[PDB]
């Protein structure tokens, strides 16, 4: 008689739904295989052309009891078998979100970012549920920025032309304290040209290199000694054609000495802390000579629009020789300031 094997055991509980359920027959073929819930609704499944193996084709649900019926037929006759199991019952669910967006072309400094809408109690599980593929292949590693967002990057800036595939396979995974993934998330992106801009406080020149060659110099005026621009490696973020900056947000009333409601053009964000490269017509005389800002890299209106036009998310701004300290590794765009050994060793525990 034929032999039936399944990837689940009869009477099992807490069966995780991160995996398909499969049925195999030896010494015969599968005539039929059905799987239903406790309202007798069938789960989508597929039987191989050779009749040897069947598998479910759609996500199983949480809190469900499934009944599997299978019948195989061979030379020695027929065999019919049945089992029931129950799936995980989460305490909570969390949903993941991943940047950069799918399809995007990004700069050589862009990390893979996966953000959850709940605190992750088992970072180790989360990391293992995330599969990142790279071509040309390159070693990278996970580091957590806070309790909800993990980052991934190589030791050195990405090589242009690298395809990155990210499969966040969290559905059915116990992420700790009864917390399970709400769904999977998939994304794909590509690394473009190496663009690295360097602001040297010694010279007050912001020089932009594309694949190693200067294509632009910009006189700049960085943060004054009271509020200096931090040295470090910054990752380019969002850009805006026009933006305001209110001191009303952060407590300071606009009708106060240090208050400021300021219309700003051509702003390219390079740190979560609020450092921008932007249009500063009112500082043009100081640019290339004196620092005058609150930290932002002030450039001329046409130098700011050039930057907004030719610089992309993930490109790099390196700041050097100023009187500030270093940008925090965990700023949000400060990832490269954490030494590799510390980054690679991670903080999953
Ligand atoms: N060893 C690896 C084992 O588990 C593996 C697993 O498979 C193992 C070997 C396994 O658990 N095999 C089970 C499936 C097995 O040998 N048999 C049962 C055979 C039937 C049975 O035990 N009882 C029947 C027949 C006996 C009748 C009698 N119990 C009765 O009460 O009437 C029954 O309950 N029948 C009646 C009609 C009913 O309930 O209505 C089945 O598929 O139903 C692998 N196979 C896959 C993915 O396909 C996979 O890799 C690691 C793991 O998952 O550990
Ligand atoms: C660029 O100069 C823009 C930003 N304005 C700033 C400001 O005047 O405060 C700074 S950020 C500043 C640093 N910490 C403060 C804060 O919110 N915390 C205490 C955490 C705000 C920034 C470069 C433009 C608005 O001036």
- How, if at all, do strands 232-235 and 78-86 pair? unpaired
Q: Is 273 annotated as a binding-site member?
A: yes
Is there a contact between 111 and 99 (Cβ–Cβ < 8 Å)?
Answer: no
3-class state of residue 302 by DSSP = helix
Its sign, for the CA torsion 124, 128, 130, 133, is positive
- How, if at all, do strands 261-269 and 239-246 pair? antiparallel
Which residues contact residue 13 at a Cβ distance below 8 angstroms, ignoring those fewer than 6 apart?
85, 86
Is there a contact between 166 and 113 (Cβ–Cβ < 8 Å)?
Answer: no
3-class state of residue 128 by DSSP = helix
Length of the chain: 349
Cα 72 to middle of ligand 1, angstroms: 13
Method: X-ray
| Burial category of 288 from C-beta neighbours within 10 Å (exposed 0-12, middle 13-18, buried 19 and up) | middle
| Domain ranges (residues) in the chain | 1-88, 89-192+335-349, 193-334
**Domain formed by 89-192+335-349, architecture:** Sandwich (2.60)
Is there a contact between 297 and 324 (Cβ–Cβ < 8 Å)?
Answer: no
Sheet with 29-36, strands from edge to edge, namely: 29-36, 65-73, 78-86
Residue nearest to atom 23 of ligand 1 (CA): 81
Q: Is 318 annotated as a binding-site member?
A: no
Q: What resolution does the deposited structure have, in angstroms?
A: 2.3
Which residues contact residue 136 at a Cβ distance below 8 angstroms, ignoring those fewer than 6 apart?
159, 161, 162
Phi first, then psi, for residue 336 (nearest 5°) are -75, -10
**Pure H helices in the chain:** 123-129, 301-310, 340-345
Distances (CA, A) of 2 to 53, 82, 238, 254, 255: 13, 14, 61, 81, 85
The ligand whose atoms approach the alpha carbon of 3 most closely is 1
Distances (CA, A) of 80 to 29, 31, 308: 12, 10, 67
Token reading at 349: 């525990």
Q: Ligand 2 pocket: which residues have CB below 6 Å?
A: 245, 250, 274-276, 293-296
Token reading at 225: 């000694």
Q: What's the CA gap between 90 and 88, in Å, rounded?
A: 6
Q: Which CATH class is domain 193-334?
A: mainly beta
The ligand whose atoms approach the alpha carbon of 261 most closely is 2
Point out the residues that are catalytic.
278, 296
3-class state of residue 318 by DSSP = strand
Nearest atom (ligand 2) to Cα of 278: 1
Residue nearest to atom 5 of ligand 2 (CA): 294
Q: What's the CA gap between 259 and 144, in Å, rounded?
A: 35
Q: What's the CA gap between 103 and 187, in Å, rounded?
A: 8
Residue nearest to atom 4 of ligand 2 (CA): 274
Residue nearest to atom 35 of ligand 1 (CA): 81
Cα 294 to middle of ligand 2, angstroms: 6
Q: Is 324 annotated as a binding-site member?
A: no
The ligand whose atoms approach the alpha carbon of 20 most closely is 1
Is there a contact between 174 and 122 (Cβ–Cβ < 8 Å)?
Answer: yes
């Amino acid at each position: 008689v034929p032999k039936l094997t399944a990837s689940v055991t009869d009477g099992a509980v807490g069966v995780t739904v991160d995996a398909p359920v499969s049925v195999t027959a030896a010494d015969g073929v599968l005539a039929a295989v059905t799987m239903v819930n406790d309202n007798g609704r069938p789960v989508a499944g597929r039987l191989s052309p050779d009749g040897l193996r069947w598998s479910t084709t759609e996500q199983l649900g949480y809190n469900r009891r499934y009944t599997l019926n299978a019948t195989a037929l061979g030379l020695g006759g027929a065999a019919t078998r049945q089992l029931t199991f129950q799936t995980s019952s989460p305490a909570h669910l969390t949903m993941p979100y991943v940047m950069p967006g799918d399809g995007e072309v990004v700069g050589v400094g862009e990390p893979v970012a996966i953000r959850f809408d709940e605190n992750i109690a088992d970072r180790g599980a989360a990391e293992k549920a995330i599969k990142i593929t790279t071509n040309p292949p390159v070693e990278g590693a996970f580091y957590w920025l806070n309790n909800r967002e993990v980052r991934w990057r190589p030791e050195h800036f990405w090589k242009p032309g690298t395809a990155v595939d990210v499969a966040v396979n969290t559905y059915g995974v116990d992420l700790g304290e009864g917390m399970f993934g709400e769904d999977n998330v998939q994304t794909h992106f590509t690394i473009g040209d190496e663009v690295i801009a360097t602001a040297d406080d010694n010279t007050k020149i912001l020089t932009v290199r594309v694949n190693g060659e200067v294509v632009k110099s910009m006189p700049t005026s960085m943060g004054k000694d009271s509020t200096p621009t931090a040295n470090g490696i910054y990752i380019v973020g969002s850009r805006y054609k026009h933006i305001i900056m209110d001191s009303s947000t952060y407590g300071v009333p606009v009708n106060s000495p240090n208050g400021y409601r300021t219309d700003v053009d051509w702003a390219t964000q390079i740190s979560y802390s609020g450092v921008f490269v932007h249009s500063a017509p009112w500082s043009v005389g100081a640019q290339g000579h004196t620092n005058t800002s609150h930290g932002c890299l002030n450039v001329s209106p046409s130098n700011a629009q050039w930057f907004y036009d030719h610089v992309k998310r993930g490109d790099i701004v390196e700041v050097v020789n100023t009187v500030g300290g270093t940008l925090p590794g965990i700023d949000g765009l400060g990832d490269w300031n954490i030494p590799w050994d510390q980054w690679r060793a991670g903080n999953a525990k």
